[PDB]
Amino acid sequence: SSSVPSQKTYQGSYGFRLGFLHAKSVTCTYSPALNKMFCQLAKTCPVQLWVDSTPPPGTRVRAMAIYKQSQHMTEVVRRCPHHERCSDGLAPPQHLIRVEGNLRVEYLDDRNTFRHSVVVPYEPPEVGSDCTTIHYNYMCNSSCMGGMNRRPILTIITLEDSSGNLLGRNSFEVHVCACPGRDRRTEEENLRKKG
Amino acid sequence: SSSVPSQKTYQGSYGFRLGFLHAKSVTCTYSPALNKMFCQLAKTCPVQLWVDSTPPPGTRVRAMAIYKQSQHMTEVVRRCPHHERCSDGLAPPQHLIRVEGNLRVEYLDDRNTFRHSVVVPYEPPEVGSDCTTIHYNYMCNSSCMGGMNRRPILTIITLEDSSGNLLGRNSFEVHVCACPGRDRRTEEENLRKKG
Amino acid sequence: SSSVPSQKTYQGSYGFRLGFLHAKSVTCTYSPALNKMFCQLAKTCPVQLWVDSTPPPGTRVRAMAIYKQSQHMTEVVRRCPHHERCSDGLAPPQHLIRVEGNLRVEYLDDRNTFRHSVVVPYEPPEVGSDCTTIHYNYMCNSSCMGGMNRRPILTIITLEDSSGNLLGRNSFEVHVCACPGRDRRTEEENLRKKG
Amino acid sequence: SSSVPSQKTYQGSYGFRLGFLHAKSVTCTYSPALNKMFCQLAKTCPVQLWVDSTPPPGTRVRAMAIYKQSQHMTEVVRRCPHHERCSDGLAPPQHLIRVEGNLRVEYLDDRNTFRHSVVVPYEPPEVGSDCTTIHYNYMCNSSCMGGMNRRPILTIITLEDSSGNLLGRNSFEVHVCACPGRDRRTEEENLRKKG
DNA sequence: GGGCATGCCCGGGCATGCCC
DNA sequence: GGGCATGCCCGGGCATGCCC
Ligand SMILES: *C[C@@H]1C(=O)C2CCN1CC2
Ligand SMILES: *C[C@@H]1C(=O)C2CCN1CC2
Ligand SMILES: *C[C@@H]1C(=O)C2CCN1CC2
Ligand SMILES: *C[C@@H]1C(=O)C2CCN1CC2
Ligand SMILES: *C[C@H]1C(=O)C2CCN1CC2
Ligand SMILES: *C[C@H]1C(=O)C2CCN1CC2
Ligand SMILES: *C[C@H]1C(=O)C2CCN1CC2
Ligand SMILES: *C[C@H]1C(=O)C2CCN1CC2
Ligand SMILES: [Zn+2]
Ligand SMILES: [Zn+2]
Ligand SMILES: [Zn+2]
Ligand SMILES: [Zn+2]
């Protein structure tokens, strides 16, 4: 009956976790200490999917954004009106999160919660590789007036079988911004000094 | 053939000029040194109309915004998409400038230049008074993404007869902002120090 | 019989001349010493038209680009293939020079010389003003491979009556570039040191 | 479901690897330290194919370019518009990579990913020889505006049987430029000093 | 082979909505 | 009223086609 999706980490029976690749305006930078990706608008944000056991055929990978703070959790995360009026052919203009480089992407609007998500098939790593990578794009800055409006979000990645069973769930915070390197360095310093 | 309206001051045969009434977040404050009004979003911005000779019956007062900088002059000033989706009953949501407190306001979209304008009847001062005041409202901040986007505007006020003849023109710069007193003080200080 | 238009200054009986408004990446900067405008791609380049005597009704203003160097004069100046595949509604994509802010702009391809030009009506200055301003845009950098390719151009402005008589002609060099302030300062220094 | 081809080295059951032949503007020079070929536009770039075991009859050799950087991987590498408008009879003008000196070259456009590829038959070395050489040509510089636009590419070379099975994969970075010797020396020095 | 011109890149710093 | 976060701006400097 809740309209807020769970954010609880659940590595599950397949041992599912995420991984991230390792400069003031670098396109993206991940902070392990904050479990937080700092990236730029509409630029590639690679996310690695790691499993210990191979999921069954037909497994899907869903990404959804939610507001991190209790006061805003129940608000659906959407693109701002400006960037909505700004396409790749498939992503509805209201969706914040896109996937690039995938021929089987699906964009969903939940008919009960109104929340947006984007789904791609799970592909196992190629022989000799330990993970599979998805290229996400965030189509607004965290600061956009009328959209995220300086409020932090979480991206929730779920691994789901074809029947809809939850196989695994993970999440990370996102700050989309002009200067990821600056903003990560400042947040990490405030954490150490004042957190 | 130009689509940019004139901004040239023209006091005209009636001696037409503007006047302004005389704190970090005051609702509005006018800088004579900069010929610039600093005011808050959707709050009253009074402008006085002064004439030496009484205009003829059916005279009208039009207000229109243009970008001040040469690089932006040819672009129509519009409300940003966020505030457009935010009414008083008569103002189209795309118009930046509204008039409050007037039963005869007319909002115009130019069919050739696409520029917006707001018009009210000219009313002579009451006996013993030297001027007539119009309460304007600016419906975005100068900073709004997808709108003014930090670009300065001028408001051009024209006195026109019923036939459309230009009787007088004056203009002033406008900065719509959260903190008019701070922003005025900073710009005036930079003018004296570095202008 | 020549396919190269004249560039000879001809102030004519109306006393026609141009004027220019007076920072590393400023949008544009004019060098009187070089008679040369340094501006940015697709940004406003204002040019003032000055006359001593009022031209007759129906006078037009034409702008055309030609290569300045003898070795390239006979080559038609065009947009590069990249920027051609990049509109305002009226300018053909092959034209280098556009006019913004004018409801009566006309773009011409000469059927014999294949050269491009853009024409607007001449409007006399408003009462109290000494000149009329046209906002040109250059849609390629001087450096564009396959277009100007680092070769300098001249813009030729002609004042023509409705019948086609040449009333006046002027010209200026143009360098469209990323950093007008840098490039002007460097060229002026080399002129003084080595010219 | 991905539209980005794998770049993972796979020597495979046949022991497949590449080899390269060993001056500021030399036509080409290969850096083992960088696994990077530096070569000139439209000039021969020989690549050797080495195998430990003889591939089956009907084996084919495919070459394809992808952008090396994560941010650009999902974009198809194409010739820039200028050089596209510049042929050998068989290569489509949009293809960056050509093969010279082969009577059986095939140029392919993938109907799903839109990526370009060039394929020739695999020929075993002549008796006494240890490798077979293919002469590739790169038809734009890495710097070309509207094409690679200064972004590094990889060339992915795949050995495939007639049925389409992947037998082996190798790749190398390519920098197409005016001065291969200069650019190699500079990148190798920056690697040692700052890498 | 030595060197220039020029698009584009930063790391330093401003303006401004919003917070106390 | 005092102060932070954040998009965007520079002036300094690199990479690279082309010139001698
Ligand atoms: C997760 C894996 C790795 O460890 C490297 C980088 C991304 N994938 C493919 C190779
Ligand atoms: C212009 C006049 C005045 O001088 C005061 C203030 C505004 N109006 C009415 C009275
Ligand atoms: C040429 C004239 C002037 O002298 C100023 C600036 C541009 N026009 C209008 C006013
Ligand atoms: C790979 C072989 C060699 O070692 C030499 C040079 C190129 N091929 C033919 C002979
Ligand atoms: C931080 C951000 C900026 O402001 C520019 C330089 C570095 N980064 C990218 C653009
Ligand atoms: C400048 C502005 C603010 O930030 C608050 C205090 C004063 N003013 C109004 C609200
Ligand atoms: C010279 C040019 C640049 O390289 C950036 C800063 C100044 N100018 C505009 C952008
Ligand atoms: C680097 C390049 C040049 O600029 C010329 C000399 C050497 N090389 C070929 C042409
Ligand atoms: Zn946005
Ligand atoms: Zn707004
Ligand atoms: Zn161009
Ligand atoms: Zn090219």
Residue numbers in the entry:
A (entry chain B), B (entry chain A), C (entry chain B), D (entry chain A): 94 to 115, 119 to 182, 185 to 293
Mind quoting what the paper says about this structure?
The MQ-modified structures include complexes of two hotspot mutants: the DNA contact mutant R273H and the structural mutant R282W, referred as R273H-DNA-MQ and R282W-DNA-MQ, respectively. In addition, residual bulks of electron density close to the sulfur atom of C124 are observed in the other two structures, R273H-DNA-MQ and wt-DNA-MQ (P1), but too weak for unambiguous MQ modeling. MQ bound to C229 is observed at high occupancy in all p53-DNA-MQ structures. New hydrogen bonds with DNA bases, mediated by MQ-C277, are observed only in R273H-DNA-MQ and R282W-DNA-MQ. In these structures, the MQ carbonyl oxygen is oriented toward the DNA, interacting with the second base of each CCC triplet (assigned as C9′ in Fig. 9a and C10′ in Fig. 9b). The presence of MQ-C277 in R273H-DNA-MQ instigates a major alternative conformation in the DNA backbones of dinucleotides C9-C10 and its symmetry-related C9′-C10′. As a result, the phosphate groups from the two symmetry-related nucleotides, C10 and C10′, are shifted by 3.7 Å towards the DNA helix center, allowing for CH···O interactions with the two symmetry-related MQr-C277 conjugates from two p53 monomers (assigned as A and C in Fig. 6a). In particular, novel hydrogen bonds are formed between the MQ bound to C277 and DNA bases in the complexes of the two mutants, R273H and R282W.
The human p53 tumor suppressor is a 393-residue protein that in response to cellular stress, acts as a transcription factor by binding as a tetramer to a wide range of DNA response elements, activating various events including DNA repair, cell-cycle arrest, senescence or apoptosis. Mutations in the p53 gene were observed in more than half of human cancers. To uncover the structural basis of rescuing p53 mutants by MQ we investigated by X-ray crystallography high-resolution structures of the core domains of mutant and wild-type p53 bound to MQ in the absence and/or the presence of their DNA response elements. These studies reveal diverse binding modes of MQ to specific cysteine residues that stabilize the proteins and their interaction with DNA.
